[PDB]
Ligand binder design. Sequence first.
Ligand SMILES: [Ca+2]
Ligand SMILES: [Ca+2]
Ligand SMILES: [Ca+2]
Ligand SMILES: [Ca+2]
Ligand SMILES: [Ca+2]
Ligand SMILES: [Ca+2]
Ligand SMILES: [Ca+2]
Ligand SMILES: [Ca+2]
Ligand SMILES: [Ca+2]
Lengths: 122, 122, 122, 122, 122, 122
Amino acid sequence: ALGDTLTITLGGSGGTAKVLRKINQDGYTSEYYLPETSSSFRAKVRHTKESVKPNQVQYERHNVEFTETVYASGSTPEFVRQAYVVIRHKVGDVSATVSDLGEALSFYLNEALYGKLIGWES
Amino acid sequence: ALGDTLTITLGGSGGTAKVLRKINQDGYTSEYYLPETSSSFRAKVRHTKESVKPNQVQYERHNVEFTETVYASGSTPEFVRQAYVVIRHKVGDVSATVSDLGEALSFYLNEALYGKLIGWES
Amino acid sequence: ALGDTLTITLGGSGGTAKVLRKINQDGYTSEYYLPETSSSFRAKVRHTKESVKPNQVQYERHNVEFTETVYASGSTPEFVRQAYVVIRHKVGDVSATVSDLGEALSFYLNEALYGKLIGWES
Amino acid sequence: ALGDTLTITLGGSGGTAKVLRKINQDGYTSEYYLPETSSSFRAKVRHTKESVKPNQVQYERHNVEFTETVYASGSTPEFVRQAYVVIRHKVGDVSATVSDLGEALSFYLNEALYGKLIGWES
Amino acid sequence: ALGDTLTITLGGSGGTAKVLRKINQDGYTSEYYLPETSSSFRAKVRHTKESVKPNQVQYERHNVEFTETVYASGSTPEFVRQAYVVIRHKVGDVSATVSDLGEALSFYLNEALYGKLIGWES
Amino acid sequence: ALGDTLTITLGGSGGTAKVLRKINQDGYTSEYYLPETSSSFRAKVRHTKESVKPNQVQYERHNVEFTETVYASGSTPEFVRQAYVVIRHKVGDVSATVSDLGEALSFYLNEALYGKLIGWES
Ligand SMILES: [Ca+2]
Ligand SMILES: [Ca+2]
Ligand SMILES: [Ca+2]
Ligand SMILES: [Ca+2]
Ligand SMILES: [Ca+2]
Ligand SMILES: [Ca+2]
Ligand SMILES: [Ca+2]
Ligand SMILES: [Ca+2]
Ligand SMILES: [Ca+2]
């Protein structure tokens, strides 16, 4: 129950806000979508357990995903851009400590690191 | 390159800083390590390319993850925490748009979003 | 979106108004309902997209459905009345032109023409 | 027996009227067609029963569809635009109600609705 | 289409307020959730139609269910506490009468009566 | 040990009073009855142990139901109305918090909630 719209601000805090709408909601998941003249945006949210095992620990998994598709033009076919995050932690763990992670990762990644990553600079 | 030491600031800005070190670099990927008495920190950065197929678009993938492990104490067994992201785009795509999408995804996620997401809100 | 309530004005403009309520949402579909002592109202909205084929044009379908149900009384058994529309167009098409075609189809249909169509003359 | 020409006013009551001509009349069915420099129009009208089998109500069907095609230009291949309505009701039913329903549906659909469906809102 | 949040006031009117959130609603049902340090709240709403058997009346079930669970602390293991209501009526009945019966049931229940029932006096 | 007469006020507070009479009580169960010219009223109360599972918590249930019957009149056959609630919790628990949960459930249901719930809203 995050809201009726999801706002995507391309270029970080730069600007160019996009406001997606629910399209679907099933199985603790959500669909967001919005089309434009030359492309479209899609947002996805999921939650899930892992299969129970006799004596190993039980975990829960979360992820969020963004996707953009650009329609074919000229002789160039159709292609998409994607970007998503995942979090995995044990059942019953402390919320604040797991929240420290993920947030640390988000603070880590910024424009320069994204540029370096694009350059295969491991 | 990307640096010899990586800093993880648990809790985002103004938090506690942990510094890792290079250990290995094989198979287009590199990993970082830091040991401690009660737990440890590890990081990996990897790049990969999907196989060529006679007629479809060719894509590149970037993945970055954080892992934290807690050693068993008393009755409590081993357990772990992770959090990672992936970026996927076509080989010839302009880098700036991919960077902008990644910056948007980074900006969206923050403490309130992580709390709600742990709350199983979809 | 589309609102929580859906209004049917039986008999076109200036007629009798019925107000259905949403009661479900699954599989990219929505359903509306209303109880009556002698009948019942349904309303359904469905969306669909065809899968990808090697070299073909990809299409999507939009459907809107109205149904009337009358409970069996005396000798007369159960029977229903129904009326629905469908829209189909390609993934990257321009919305405005499809909308204009839909407006044309809606404007062509009217009371006298329905009375003619029930007359079996092609 | 609708007439020797069928008129389609693109954009609803706005303007841009097209005039098709009958091409055929076979088996309770009719066709209309009109060629142009870069596109064509076509309309069809059909009526049918259903297969009978023991102790059920017997039903009727009226179908009307609009079809629009655009010829290949440059790299972009051919594609079509379609929009059609179907009416179903029982033999011997009262005509005025079957028209009041159906004309209510015609009144419901307009610019805003078609925009919503193209937006995938349900 | 109840709403985006549910309010539970423990101890009847004038008590402590608790706010639940959407997590899911697929099969005409709904489910709510909220976590706490030592407990969690869950609320679920269901609709169902009883099995059809020829030449007999048709009925409808509506169910509303509250659950509260407390996490184990030492020797004491998990244990749970729920209270739920059910309403059954025939299809096509009058809403007002069923509502009045339910209101009478609700008005009969109160502080003293729950104390008596938990006192086991038949 | 409730008493000799149970009062049902159809329509909640300020409604029409109906006084029932005790008829029987054998197995920790009690029921009340009243006949009428066109209907009939009945109430019941039950208590029971849940089955004992080796090395798990032990639970007990309190149940109460209202039933309303309308005799066949001409074409219309027999039909009935009901409304009942159930309480479950473990042995040795504190009665007052359980009363509080029942109080919350009872306070939630009222005019509007019943009106919307009978409309199949979920
Ligand atoms: Ca930028
Ligand atoms: Ca924090
Ligand atoms: Ca190496
Ligand atoms: Ca009319
Ligand atoms: Ca227009
Ligand atoms: Ca002919
Ligand atoms: Ca109290
Ligand atoms: Ca759903
Ligand atoms: Ca009332």
